[PDB]
Amino acid sequence: DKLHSQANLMRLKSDLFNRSYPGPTKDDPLTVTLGFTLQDIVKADSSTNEVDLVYYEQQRWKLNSLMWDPNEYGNITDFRTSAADIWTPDITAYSSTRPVQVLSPQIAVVTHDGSVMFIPAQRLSFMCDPTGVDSEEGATCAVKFGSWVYSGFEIDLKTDTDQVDLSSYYASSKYEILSATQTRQVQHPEPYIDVNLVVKFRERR
Amino acid sequence: DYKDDDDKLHSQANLMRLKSDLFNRSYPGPTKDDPLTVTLGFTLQDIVKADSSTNEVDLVYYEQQRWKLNSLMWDPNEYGNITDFRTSAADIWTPDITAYSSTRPVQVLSPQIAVVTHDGSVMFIPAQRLSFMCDPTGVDSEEGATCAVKFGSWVYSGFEIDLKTDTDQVDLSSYYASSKYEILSATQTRQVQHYSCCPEPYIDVNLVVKFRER
Amino acid sequence: DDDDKLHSQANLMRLKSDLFNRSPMYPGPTKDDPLTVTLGFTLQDIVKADSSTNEVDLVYYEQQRWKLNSLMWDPNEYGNITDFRTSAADIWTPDITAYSSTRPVQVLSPQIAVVTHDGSVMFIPAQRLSFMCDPTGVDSEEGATCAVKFGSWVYSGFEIDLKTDTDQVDLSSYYASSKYEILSATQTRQVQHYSCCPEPYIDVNLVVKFRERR
Amino acid sequence: LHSQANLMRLKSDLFNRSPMYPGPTKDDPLTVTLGFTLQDIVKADSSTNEVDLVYYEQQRWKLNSLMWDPNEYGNITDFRTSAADIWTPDITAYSSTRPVQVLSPQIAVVTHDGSVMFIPAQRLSFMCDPTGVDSEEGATCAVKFGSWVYSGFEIDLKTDTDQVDLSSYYASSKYEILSATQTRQVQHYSCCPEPYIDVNLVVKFRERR
Amino acid sequence: DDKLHSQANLMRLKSDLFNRSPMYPGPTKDDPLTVTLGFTLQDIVKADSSTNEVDLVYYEQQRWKLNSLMWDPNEYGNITDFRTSAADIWTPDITAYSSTRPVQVLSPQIAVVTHDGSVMFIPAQRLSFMCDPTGVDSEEGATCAVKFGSWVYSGFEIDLKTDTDQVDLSSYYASSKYEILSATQTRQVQHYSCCPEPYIDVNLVVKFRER
Ligand SMILES: *[C@@H]1O[C@H](CO)[C@@H](O[C@@H]2O[C@H](CO)[C@@H](O[C@@H]3O[C@H](CO[C@H]4O[C@H](CO)[C@@H](O)[C@H](O)[C@@H]4O)[C@@H](O)[C@H](O[C@H]4O[C@H](CO)[C@@H](O)[C@H](O)[C@@H]4O)[C@@H]3O)[C@H](O)[C@H]2NC(C)=O)[C@H](O)[C@H]1NC(C)=O
Ligand SMILES: COc1cc(O)ccc1/C=C1\CCCN=C1c1cccnc1
Ligand SMILES: COc1cc(O)ccc1/C=C1\CCCN=C1c1cccnc1
Ligand SMILES: COc1cc(O)ccc1/C=C1\CCCN=C1c1cccnc1
Ligand SMILES: COc1cc(O)ccc1/C=C1\CCCN=C1c1cccnc1
Numbered sequence A: 001d002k003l004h005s006q007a008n009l010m011r012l013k014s015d016l017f018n019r020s021y022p023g024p025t026k027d028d029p030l031t032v033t034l035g036f037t038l039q040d041i042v043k044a045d046s047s048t049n050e051v052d053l054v055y056y057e058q059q060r061w062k063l064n065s066l067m068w069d070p071n072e073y074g075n076i077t078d079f080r081t082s083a084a085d086i087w088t089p090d091i092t093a094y095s096s097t098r099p100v101q102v103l104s105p106q107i108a109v110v111t112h113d114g115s116v117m118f119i120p121a122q123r124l125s126f127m128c129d130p131t132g133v134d135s136e137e138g139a140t141c142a143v144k145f146g147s148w149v150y151s152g153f154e155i156d157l158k159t160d161t162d163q164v165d166l167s168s169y170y171a172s173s174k175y176e177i178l179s180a181t182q183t184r185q186v187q188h189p190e191p192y193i194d195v196n197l198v199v200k201f202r203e204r205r
Numbered sequence B: 001d002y003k004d005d006d007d008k009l010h011s012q013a014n015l016m017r018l019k020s021d022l023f024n025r026s027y028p029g030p031t032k033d034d035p036l037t038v039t040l041g042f043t044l045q046d047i048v049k050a051d052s053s054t055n056e057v058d059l060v061y062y063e064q065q066r067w068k069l070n071s072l073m074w075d076p077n078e079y080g081n082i083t084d085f086r087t088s089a090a091d092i093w094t095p096d097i098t099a100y101s102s103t104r105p106v107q108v109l110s111p112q113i114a115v116v117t118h119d120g121s122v123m124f125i126p127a128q129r130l131s132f133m134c135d136p137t138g139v140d141s142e143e144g145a146t147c148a149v150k151f152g153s154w155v156y157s158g159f160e161i162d163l164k165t166d167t168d169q170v171d172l173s174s175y176y177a178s179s180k181y182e183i184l185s186a187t188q189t190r191q192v193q194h195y196s197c198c199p200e201p202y203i204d205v206n207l208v209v210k211f212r213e214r
Numbered sequence C: 001d002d003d004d005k006l007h008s009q010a011n012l013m014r015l016k017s018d019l020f021n022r023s024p025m026y027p028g029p030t031k032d033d034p035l036t037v038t039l040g041f042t043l044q045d046i047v048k049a050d051s052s053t054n055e056v057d058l059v060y061y062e063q064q065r066w067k068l069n070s071l072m073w074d075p076n077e078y079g080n081i082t083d084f085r086t087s088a089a090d091i092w093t094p095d096i097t098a099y100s101s102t103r104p105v106q107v108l109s110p111q112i113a114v115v116t117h118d119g120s121v122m123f124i125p126a127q128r129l130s131f132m133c134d135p136t137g138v139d140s141e142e143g144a145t146c147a148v149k150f151g152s153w154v155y156s157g158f159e160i161d162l163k164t165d166t167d168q169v170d171l172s173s174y175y176a177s178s179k180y181e182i183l184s185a186t187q188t189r190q191v192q193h194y195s196c197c198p199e200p201y202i203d204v205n206l207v208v209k210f211r212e213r214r
Numbered sequence D: 001l002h003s004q005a006n007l008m009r010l011k012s013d014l015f016n017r018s019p020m021y022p023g024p025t026k027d028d029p030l031t032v033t034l035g036f037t038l039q040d041i042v043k044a045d046s047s048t049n050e051v052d053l054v055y056y057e058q059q060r061w062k063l064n065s066l067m068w069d070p071n072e073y074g075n076i077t078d079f080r081t082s083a084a085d086i087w088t089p090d091i092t093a094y095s096s097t098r099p100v101q102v103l104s105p106q107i108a109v110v111t112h113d114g115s116v117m118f119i120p121a122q123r124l125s126f127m128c129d130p131t132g133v134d135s136e137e138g139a140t141c142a143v144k145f146g147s148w149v150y151s152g153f154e155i156d157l158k159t160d161t162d163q164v165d166l167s168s169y170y171a172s173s174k175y176e177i178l179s180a181t182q183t184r185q186v187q188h189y190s191c192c193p194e195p196y197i198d199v200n201l202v203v204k205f206r207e208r209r
Numbered sequence E: 001d002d003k004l005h006s007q008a009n010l011m012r013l014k015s016d017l018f019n020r021s022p023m024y025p026g027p028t029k030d031d032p033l034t035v036t037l038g039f040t041l042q043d044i045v046k047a048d049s050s051t052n053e054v055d056l057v058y059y060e061q062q063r064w065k066l067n068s069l070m071w072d073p074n075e076y077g078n079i080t081d082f083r084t085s086a087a088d089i090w091t092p093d094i095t096a097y098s099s100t101r102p103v104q105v106l107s108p109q110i111a112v113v114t115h116d117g118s119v120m121f122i123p124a125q126r127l128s129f130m131c132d133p134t135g136v137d138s139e140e141g142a143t144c145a146v147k148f149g150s151w152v153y154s155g156f157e158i159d160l161k162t163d164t165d166q167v168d169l170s171s172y173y174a175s176s177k178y179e180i181l182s183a184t185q186t187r188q189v190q191h192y193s194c195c196p197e198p199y200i201d202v203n204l205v206v207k208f209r210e211r
């Protein structure tokens, strides 16, 4: 049975990858859903106006080409694969000051409806003036995320909620979160889309 | 003699043939219909740094991982009584066990080579330096600071990867005697948790270390 | 229309295969077949100015544009595809280098180019660069001035020529709360004669005048 | 041209026409000789109890599968090749605190008797309390090196001398070397019956005056 | 058409040299190689008196010649030279002997090959090396030195030479924290008591002081 279930999974992976994606186009556009889980504000450097965040970046999209019928593959409804084995979106912070550091494996989960969920943990340094962090009102910084090379005609971006997930925020961080929002923005001949991460924070008093 | 020389060549041939049969002739990872149990254990070697400016602590440890696969089994009698072999971890599937609250990418300090035994068991023990979220307030006190970090599969839920420990006591037999920090206690405990992100329970091992300035 | 989508992917896959697999990699420019690369900078931030080492760290987007006959197609042969995105590793890219960096440049963005059916390519890497700069005067009204040349490392002006669209650096994305304010930022094509080499190299000289924000 | 052809033929014969060496085993064990040449103690950090060393690590071993008759190859007696082209031992510091950094090319010299000499230059941070370094008596630290995954029944270790080579130690280092030894140790765990082998590098050092 | 034939000729040349020959196995006693080395010092970035490490930025010019890289330009549309990734060809294992961190490469690594088989390769590098900067804040300044040479080849396999013993200072950064008093690059033949073979290095000696 286990031999058969393994064989089924190997067969599924082969048919989807080997017996056949060039990325989205205006004729075949994709929607990427983005969500942040903020874990920690590690450092806020007033000498350079750089702040360092650690977060999980949840990315989800769906491809017709990743759809299968579970009945054809021993009731398998999902599988895991290295993110290097599939196309992934070029979602980038627009105002980072150092290359993003990847903290987790980079493995995606593919479901039989064609949906892909990819949640890399990252540490990001970005442009931020932390003046006011030691006051009741705190400091506010923001950073936009979006595709580097695809317009809104090829990749639409969206959020499921504008409330950043703070359920995993480190309780003993040097900084307390007053608010954290993630808001889709459209800028205008093709539309350009980003998600603006806005964090208000202050010294844990 | 020549016989002994031949026996060495045969031994090499048998090992090359075993590795070929296991890897070349014939694992896509665990599934709900074939879940895998990974045993984890930590050997803490040193608390290198406890940074109160950022609430990051840096640990050096060996992370022992064990699992067993039917697909790595062989009969030693078919292979010159070979009972185990060493192979680059890149040659086999390995679990995606990750710290949940690191603050910098984990750094690997050792070769990444696994030992595979004829019963299909694998043992893999990478040495790592990890920076993780920890408030070291109280490190300059009798009772010390207490920090914790969860380790588990990144992408497999408890439907596919289960974890276990052999003991809840961290191996402190190799702890650096002249570290800046002395260890008061170090435990490793399996936990089953749900996250609002996702409907399936994930398993982790929670490493909890209580330490103070020496 | 799910089939029109399938047809559009097939057409793009076929185009890329034709340009990349059923055609051999462009060997780079030569004196018989020189290339003009258009360069433009968008300065985002002066992050750090180190007076102990005389190094300054910039974050910028470097726009590169060139055109190759070998990347041309007829859109009518490929379902009216007029352009596509592809990893910059799939195509030749120019070896444009800062001539006075003090650390390897760090890439901040995906390295993906846009190729258009007339054979034109646009590639816009975001970078952090440390370069040689004495920031003396940064704490004064007149500020500090530093300069850095960008150009091909190995191709002379007989092989790679450069041009700009304007000599004004794009400051429309400069971080408003930077520690440093920009007084001026220019980008100027130069023909550079080096005593080592009989052929001159073309560069774009980026000159930035800046001061500590008030 | 014939000398070049002879060498290309030798390498092809050794690397293409004859099987892989799969590493040592209980039935085909290997002796690895280790020696250190200490070049500099760069940094001794008393805030973290880490010391940084720069050294050359000489490794030697011999394989029947790397032997040839020079007479068959225009009297070539040795050659140099990328260490990636051949099996190399997984010799590791046991108490490093950062990944070792390689400072040189990693190229092995193979001799016709099957012996291999591989001498990477390395910078290593390791666990060390430098207390006493600002005293006449100095500080003492130690680090063990050995195979990560092979027991003494698969890889034995040996030194040619127990004196660390100090002939290349940097004359204007912040630290002077009082002594440096490299000593083979055999330990037996309760886990297992086979012996486990390391070479313990012990350095006594003090701030230069 | 002229340009298509020129590209075709170049693609054919590279194919013939690389794709269609057995890889050059490096020099030997019977087929020794001369490598010419020269340095262009661009900046002393940092001089650390707490660890006695100094950081230099320099261009390292390397030139050698291989018969296996020769061609008759008449057979290839009169192409006389080309540029190629340094990873496409053998390069000499020239290394600093007293670095303290891995050298960092600042430029592309692309070589120029000429029809006579000569190769020119000039990587820009940042190097940290062992240096006591005592005296840097004095009129006499400090003096440091670092040897460069093959890691594994003797003087009977790789000879090193310089064209000049004067380091190229023409591109030295005029506003560096440190000014250069002198910089020389001297070929040295070293013997080791083990072995009768000569071993060759180029000793880079820099005298410098705070500007
Ligand atoms: C690769 O390396 C091998 C090993 O060195 C070379 O083989 C040797 O080649 C030399 C040169 O031809 C030979 O030297 C000659 O030896 C003769 C004696 O031969 C017998 O005794 C020797 C020594 O015990 C035995 O090893 C050998 O098997 C024989 O039993 C001498 O009579 C010769 O002297 C005369 O010739 C020289 C010039 O060559 C004159 O100057 C002298 O004055 C005199 O007239 C000579 O010394 C040697 O025998 C070979 N040794 C072996 C083991 O074969 C290869 O030639 C070398 N290169 C190549 C391409 O193979
Ligand atoms: C030269 O590049 C720019 C200058 C500006 O002043 C503003 C935006 C961009 C490009 C951007 C912005 C962020 C999304 N990515 C790009 C981009 C655009 C085209 C190709 N590659 C990248
Ligand atoms: C966006 O993801 C999360 C938000 C939370 O608030 C808490 C946990 C996770 C996911 C985790 C926890 C770490 C181990 N695995 C995951 C995960 C789950 C699914 C896919 N990839 C990663
Ligand atoms: C030895 O090389 C140099 C010495 C100098 O004093 C100044 C400049 C260069 C090279 C340069 C400068 C322009 C960019 N490219 C080169 C170059 C020249 C030849 C080969 N590779 C790189
Ligand atoms: C969990 O591993 C250990 C705990 C201890 O308390 C002591 C030693 C080791 C293993 C070591 C020590 C260093 C050499 N290699 C190993 C090892 C042993 C087996 C497999 N992989 C690595």
Ligand SMILES: COc1cc(O)ccc1/C=C1\CCCN=C1c1cccnc1
Binding pocket: D037, D056, D058, D109, D117, D118, D119, D165, D167, D168, E097, E150, E151, E152
């Ligand atoms: C352990 O090796 C040495 C000890 C010393 O005290 C001095 C020199 C060397 C080797 C050197 C010198 C630097 C260049 N390369 C070698 C070398 C020699 C043999 C194999 N690999 C490297």
Ligand SMILES: *[C@@H]1O[C@H](CO)[C@@H](O)[C@H](O)[C@H]1NC(C)=O
Binding pocket: E073, E074, E076, E077, E078
């Ligand atoms: C190259 O030069 C030679 C002689 O100078 C000439 O005969 C030949 O036709 C020229 N062109 C080509 C493409 O070989």
